Ligand SMILES: Nc1ncnc2c1ncn2[C@@H]1O[C@H](COP(=O)(O)OP(=O)(O)OP(=O)(O)O)[C@@H](O)[C@H]1O
C-alpha cells in the first residue's frame with residue numbers, strides 16, 4: 056500500500072518492515088537492534104526512516120551496548136553514526152524526531168557544547184528543537200560555568216616553561 | 226559377521242560374492258578391524274583407548290592453573306562532577322597511578 | 331556406524347608433498363578435497379589433492395604431522411573440501427589455517443569459494459580510516475576495496491596495516507557492532523616471534539577483541555603457508571554474510587607464492603616465468619576478487635584487503651608484483667629512499683594511487699583532499715628547487731612542506747585530530763611558523779588547547795578537548811555554516827598564541843643543551859602525533 | 860593434578876604469569892608456607908602503618 | 917561557602933562518592949582498592965588547608 060522501493064540494480068524490494076521494528080523495541084541492549092537491521096537487510100527489507108528512529112529510541116533508552124559492559128561506550132556516537140549511515144550510505148534523510156532523540160542524550164550526558172552544535176544544525180535544516188531541551192542545555196552550561204567545570208581542569212593549568220619531552224607528557 | 230555383510234549391503238556393490246579372511250594383530254588386544262568394499266572400520270583397543278585418552282590429554286593441556294583467571298570487564302569511570310569540583314587537576318594523575326598499581330601492585 | 335573410506339596407500343613423500351598409490355581401480359578420488367593419512371592408530375595427517383594422473387596416482391599437499399608420514403600408510407578420504415571453523419567465537423585468537431588454535435603465554439566454512447558476482451556487490455561508498463593522513467586524504471582507502479602495500483624490506487609495510495587495526499578500535503567501542511570493522515592478520519612464512527610481538531601490541535591497545543591472527547610461520551609446511559590467506563578470507567565470508575565488516579591483512583604474499591612454487595615444482599608441474607607454475611596470477615585473483623562491498627540484498631557487508639608484497643631494489647617489474655598491481659585497485663608504494671631519507675611512513679605519492687577516490691572518503695575529507703591534490707600537484711613541480719626566494723617563496727612551497735611535516739607520524743591519527751591539522755595548512759594559518767615547529771603546533775592544536783588556557787574562549791563549542799566533535803564534523807562537514815567560523819576562531823588564536831608565546835621563546839635559544847632538549851621534543855611530537 | 864600445582868606454588872617452585880604475586884585471595888580465585896600465606900591475606904599497608912606485625916606474628 | 921560544605925561532606929564519606937560495588941567486582945585484590953581510597957583523602961586535606 057505504498058510506493059514500491061527498488062535497489063540500485065533496479066530489483067524489486069520488500070517494504071514489510073513492521074515485524075522487524077517490533078524486535079527493535081523489544082530489545083534490551085542497543086547492540087541487538089543493529090543486528091536486527093542486519094537480519095532485516097539480508098531479507099531484502101532495507102531499513103526506512105521509522106526503523107532507524109526506532110533504533111535511536113532503543114539506543115537512548117537502553118542502559119548499555121551489550122550485556123556485559125564495554126570500555127569506550129559513547130551513547131552519542133552510535134546515534135550520530137546511524138545518521139551517517141542514513142544520509143550518505145542509504146540516501147534516507149533524518150527528521151525532527153531523529154535529531155530529537157539525539158539531543159536528549161547530550162542533555163543526559165551533560166555535554167552542553169555538542170548540544171549547541173545540534174541546535175544550530177537543526178535550524179540550518181529547518182528543524183526546530185523543543186525548548187524543554189534547549190533550556191536544559193543552557194542549564195547544564197550555566198552550572199558548569201559557575202562551578203569551573205566549563206572546561207576540564209587539565210586544560211586550565213600552566214604549561215612547562217621549559218621545553219622537555221617528559222613535562223609535556225610524551 | 227552381521228556388521229560385515231551389513232557393510233557389504235551399504236556398499237554400492239552387493240551382487241559380488243563376499244570372501245572373508247581373518248588375521249591376527251599383536252598390537253590390538255581388544256576389538257577388531259574390518260575392511261569391506263574399500264571401507265574400513267576400526268574398533269580396537271589401541272584406537273578406542275587412545276581416542277578416549279585423547280580427550281583427557283586435550284583437557285589437561287587446555288587448563289593453566291599457574292595463570293590467573295580474567296576478571297570481569299570494567300566500564301568507563303564516568304567520574305561525578307562533585308569529585309571533579311573537589312579535585313580539578315588531580316583525577317588524571319590518580320587514574321594514571323591506578324593503572325600503574327593495577328599493573329605492578 | 332562410521333566407517334572411514336580408504337582410497338590407497340602412501341607411495342612416496344617429498345618433504346611437504348606426497349604421492350598416493352590407489353588400492354583399487356573403481357575407486358575414484360575428487361579434486362581439491364581433503365584426504366587423511368593414518369600416520370598412527372591415534373593421529374591423522376590432513377592433506378589435499380593437487381593432482382590426478384592417468385596412473386590413478388594422486389599428487390598430495392600435506393598440512394599436518396608430516397614427520398609421522400611413511401610409505402605404505404593407509405590413506406582415507408572425506409570426500410569434502412577443506413573447511414575450517416568460523417564464527418564470532420574465533421575473535422581474540424591465533425589460529426592455524428586448519429582452525430587449530432596456537433596457545434600463548436559447529437559451523438564450518440569452505441576454504442575456496444567463488445567470489446561475489448557482478449550483481450551481488452555494491453560500489454564503494456564508505457571509508458576505512460587507516461589513521462594516516464596520506465592514506466585518508468590522498469590515497470583514500472574504502473570498504474570493499476583491495477589496496478596493495480608495496481615496499482622494499484623494512485619500510486613500514488607491516489605497520490600501516492597494524493595501525494589500521496589499531497585505529498578502528500576506539501570507534502568500534504563507540505559505534506554499534508554492525509558498522510565496526512573487525513580484522514584478520516595473516517602471517518605467511520613470517521617468523522614466529524614477529525607474530526608474538528603483534529599479538530602483544532594488539533593486546534596492549536586492546537585491539538585483539540576485534541582481531542584474529544592466521545599464523546603460517548616459516549617452519550610450517552608450504553601447503554599451510556599456501557592456504558593461510560584463504561583461511562583468512564574464509565573467516566571474512568561469515569562477516570560478509572552476517573552483514574558485518576572485516577579487514578584482511580595478508581602479510582607477504584610473495585611468501586605465499588614461493589609456497590605454491592615449492593608445491594607445484596616438487597609435484598612435477600612444469601615451471602614458468604621466474605620458476606613459478608604460471609597460474610600464480612589466478613591464485614591471487616581467487617584470493618582478492620573475494621573482497622567486495624556486498625549488495626544490500628547480501629547485508630551491505632564488506633571485507634577490505636591490505637595485501638603486502640615485498641620488493642627488491644624498488645622495482646615494480648617482478649612477476650608477482652605486476653600480477654598483484656594488475657589485480658588490486660590501488661597501491662601504497664613505500665620507497666626506501668624516503669624511509670632512509672627521514673620521513674616515516676615513506677609513502678611515495680607519485681607511484682601510490684587509489685582507484686576509488688572521493689567516493690570512499692568523507693564529506694569533510696573530500697574538500698581537504700581535493701585541495702591537497704591541487705597543492706601537491708603544484709608543489710611537485712617546484713619542490714625540486716633549493717629555496718632561493720626565501721621571502722619570495724610561493725605559498726604552495728610553504729603549505730606543501732608543512733603538510734609533509736604533518737604526514738610524518740608513527741601511529742594512527744583520529745579523524746578529528748587529522749583534518750584540523752590539514753585545514754590550517756590548506757588555508758594558510760600555519761604559514762608564519764617554520765617547518766621544524768609544524769608538529770609541536772599540531773601537538774598543542776590537538777592535546778593542549780591554548781585558548782582554553784589563555785582565557786581566549788569566545789567559541790561556544792568548538793574545542794579539541796571534547797573529542798566527540800568527530801561525528802558532527804563527519805556528518806555536517808567543515809565547510810558548513812555552523813562549523814566554519816568557529817573553526818577559524820579557534821585556529822587563528824592558536825596561531826597567534828603560538829607565534830607570540832612559544833615560537834618567540836624557541837627562536838631565542840642559543841645554548842646546545844637547551845637546543846638539544848628542544849630538538850628531541852620535536853622528534854617526540856613527530857612520533858606521538 | 861591441580862592440588863599438585865597448588866603445592867608447587869606454595870613451595871615456590873613455580874612462578875605465575877606477568878610476575879603475579881602469591882596471596883591467599885589471589886590463590887583462592889585461581890581455584891610454614893601456609894602460615895606465611897595467612898600473613899599475606901592481611902593488607903600490607905595496614906600492617907606496616909599500624910605496626911601490627913611489629914609485636915610479632 | 918558551597919565549596920566548603922562540599923569538602924566537609926566529602927571528607928565525612930569519601931568511600932560513598934566512589935562506586936564501591938563496581939570497584940570490588942573489578943579489582944582482584946581488595947588491597948589495591950584500599951590504597952586508591954587512601955590517596956583521595958590526603959588530596960582533600962591538603963586542598964582545604
Ligand atoms: N611511521 C613510522 N614511524 C616510526 N617508525 C616506523 C614507522 N613505520 C615503520 N617504522 C619502523 O620501521 C621498522 C620496520 O617496520 P615494518 O615492521 O613495517 O617493516 P616491514 O615493511 O614489515 O619490513 P619487513 O617485513 O622486512 O620487516 C620498525 O622498526 C618500525 O617501527
Ligand SMILES: [Mg+2]
Pocket residue numbers: 487488581
Ligand atoms: Mg613485514
